[PDB]
């Protein structure tokens, strides 16, 4: 359909209508409410089935419609109102389009993050009064759903209607199973934080009452199988956002009460078995999410004790556990790892077929799913497998920032891997050749690696500090208080002298014919590179007396002459870094030079980060 | 379309599941189910306790008796009754072995923990009277343990930190306090999700006053507090405020809670927000309380939250003999507890960060509890709030970006949110702010708004070219998170359907932009602009707003 | 049991066995000062959510029976376990006729 171009015309019109002035939000009403019909129609025709179920084109048209309501911010300051709340007559048909998008986790996270913006943010202009009535109507809807969830326990409902009532349950539920970054005080129960919002255990109560309702009322349709396996998916989506997001290690939990709750919940669902469904990696997905959360951390006895599946073990079979094929596969995997570090791991050796440690599996094979892979090319499935299995690496089980310096260009640890010098020389030769005109993505990842690795060659001179142990640096990256630059002591080593990273970086990213301007953001990237390399390493002179600001301080100045915050403030931070020194701050020649520099510019863009740099 | 009655339901006896989740209940790092840790404890300064058939005889493991109680009142009560009855009984036990100053009160911590596992096993039916009972109860217990919550900021000469290096009883006291503060949170939760037709009961001046004394003992502005208790107290404040909003007939109970009493909350809570975080020495006696530490000397998780390493949970895996009917328990040690994994400090700081999210959001919740207001917000919730907002702008800039650590994005999201708090205060609560305090902090206000303002045009990328380089130099943590959510942590975000990465390239990019001081959502940017360009009040001098804006334009 | 004034599970909780520091049939961790009853409660509890009615019975029968044995064939230790273990076996056995299964009873 060409209604793709119809929505294109409407979004081009709204983009044209910016505001009275060029900058386009206008928090307050401008009674000029001309796109009112199109705005209503956005959701009036969202209840259709032609291209209202498509993504790509139509999806970005809806993303542009969200930007139009932020370009009009709040027209309710003098207009846009209804009998009760108009923001709720929006949310309700948004939840209709949600039950349309009921299953697609994509289509639900995106929609409720933008409506998050709408409620947690785009009414957050005001807060109290609109929020109050919004929460009132939300609680009304919740009570209605709960009262409807009762009479289906006794059979006097429909079949599709029952499916959709329990699905609307799920939709409220997932809408509610994210972390703070998705809502705020808009909804009554997602307002607090630190392991509890007024939701979290209103929600545990929800989950346990609905387990009651499930063991009370059921039906044998595979769609119902799905709208229950999605519920175990959500009862672990409960915890995924309730994690401290530990970089790249499986994210430790904020609250071991989510841990015990979900343990109890999916273990009672091992019991329930309600609605088995074929072709379902969701089951083992949840089990391995949670075990990933429970690998070998202090949560160990927690998981094994409050979710013991082990009592479905039965080594004497090749059809091992009774839930579903690939589930029981990965669950025997998790089981078998449990047994692994239970028994003496000396009884385990790396048998090298799949190179994971294996103890004596059994005299007879009896291990059809001991280590094998199984997926319809499902990278998530096999990566669950691999992380959990190799989690007892007993070798290179560390890193996050250094692991990212390797993630972009995968296949990169095919060698020493631990070794600093391999990435040293590879990024050297990269910036020596690896660009023609467009290497402004991978070269950029090499500059973030150059910064991190400066901070690593700082982590050293203190026995094993290589890429191995690196979630973030110390002298630069453990956040502090006080005068932070107290930490940065001049007795540090000379940059170029004790960093070939500096030598060849000074050659390449600093003696660039286009360092003046090749990619503003890449400029700021190498800027933070210099920031950190200096924070760790003694400063070479900015100016050698006879001019030549050191083709890096030159970047400081020129970006200090930016047009917005970006390159400008990213420059400002490091002036002091050159100042903290000795033998170049000896006669404070550096100090006086940079004092004259902070007084060698008055351009209006830069008064702010000027006052920063001075500070 | 029948949904059939299943004429042979198997529906759990949740009191039985509770009996289980008690007898098995094990704290994080313990050798035993903490119930059994009780179950190996006889005490010789309480010969014989009873409240209602709870004889901890002269020869009883406090466990032996408590588990037996579980059995008795299991036969007696129904679920709500059993919650109430364990509350009353286990409590009056906590007293009689707490106000008895010569006996091994290490039952008490796990007894409180049992309060916790009770109230938060069935917060559905737990009810106001016993709620307040245990609330006020361990409140007076914390007034019992005045010593540890109020230990000199640095042990001024005369006072010496020559303590027996003892998380032994340090655990006893601290554990009780934090566990019971989490129990206060869970009691607030039973009422917090309880119908707001019935909110005139668990609120009373006794709740408030007990919390006065305990809150003031924990947030010890003069002595050296500990961060589990600080967390826990401020969390209690938080949920308190949550219900101060979520109570429908709000004026009456807002009259009940004294204005000076919120004021004595928020003097200490501003004190908190102005206390800071020194990771490198967070596990070391640092400066006078201006360095939230949670020192390894007093270091475990807590209950609805796990902030420390809980290393001393391992020494709870040496808390009792585990092979002996100990009268006094096995050491836990302040010295033994705590170049290894500063991820410890990082996750704990990600907490303290989320703590100050709590603090900002409940300052914000105060902002809502009054639309017409009183002494707690008198322009002071602009002074201190914007002081935090600008302190975090200055810290994120001067160090934290480039410090490029796990904290970045969480902190920047939440301090842009405290910006939004400043916004709604300065728009709706614009009524209160008077000249004296808009002059005390004209500074902070105007220039924090200016800092956020120098961004919108953003001629740098406006796209995913190398602002994704920035997403790598700082947001590398959230890059690990996009990798982890697509490869480990979403059933559907593997094999992306091509309508989502088109969005990712710019969305995660403006995420890292909000990290790196720029490209805050047009929402955010015009919030910050309209806070300042609100010429209705001469926060800016009209003849110099041009010199202001010309850093960007306008 | 008449005169055994206790929750006989607690009775069991008062049964430590130093010599045997290694025990595990269906997850039955036991050590020196580690009470038979501590592992009894261990089982009872998580076995409730794991096992069903009769499979709970059978699991108790066989596990606590392995206990019956390895203490019985352990003449060096004393067997205070087996009397009340067997008393537990009886509460099990009695609990229902129809629920209790003849296979378990056989074993």
Numbering used by the authors:
A (entry chain F): 2 to 32, 44 to 474, 480 to 632
B (entry chain D): 189 to 526, 532 to 747
C (entry chain C): 215 to 321
Give me lines lifted from the publication on this model.
The ataxia-telangiectasia mutated (ATM) and ATM-Rad3-related (ATR) are apical kinases that orchestrate the multifaceted DNA damage response to a variety of insults and regulate genomic stability. The basal kinase activity of ATR plays critical regulatory roles during normal cell-cycle progression and aberrant activation of ATR signaling pathway can drive cells into senescence. In short, our study reveals a novel gating mechanism by which kinase N-lobe toggles between two alternative docking sites and recurrently commits the Mec1/ATR kinase for substrate recruitment, confined catalysis and product release.
We next determined the structure of Mec1-Ddc2 complex endogenously activated by MMS. Only one state could be stably classified with a resolution of 4.0 Å. The assembly adopts an asymmetric conformation despite having two identical Mec1-Ddc2 heterodimers. The whole molecule is significantly compressed, with the length and height have been reduced to 200 Å and 155 Å, respectively. We refer two monomers as ‘MMS-mono1’ and ‘MMS-mono2’, which demonstrate similar conformational changes at the domain level. After the Pincer and C-lobe are superimposed with each other, the FAT and kinase N-lobe move down by ~10 Å, whereas the Spiral of α-solenoid moves upwards by ~11 Å relative to their positions in the structure with the basal activity. The structures of Ddc2 and Mec1 Spiral domain are well matched, but the conformations of Bridge and FATKIN are significantly different, especially the significant displacement of LBE. FATC rotates 110 degrees downward, coupled with the displacement of PRD Kα10 along with Kα9 and Kα8 downward to the left in the range of 8~12 Å, which more significantly exposes the activation loop to facilitate substrate binding and catalysis. The most significant conformational divergence between the two monomers is at the position of LBE Kα4a and kinase N-lobe. In MMS-mono, the kinase N-lobe packs against the HEAT 25 R/26 R (residues 1005–1090), in close proximity to the Ser1333 residue in human ATR (corresponding to Thr1092 in Mec1).
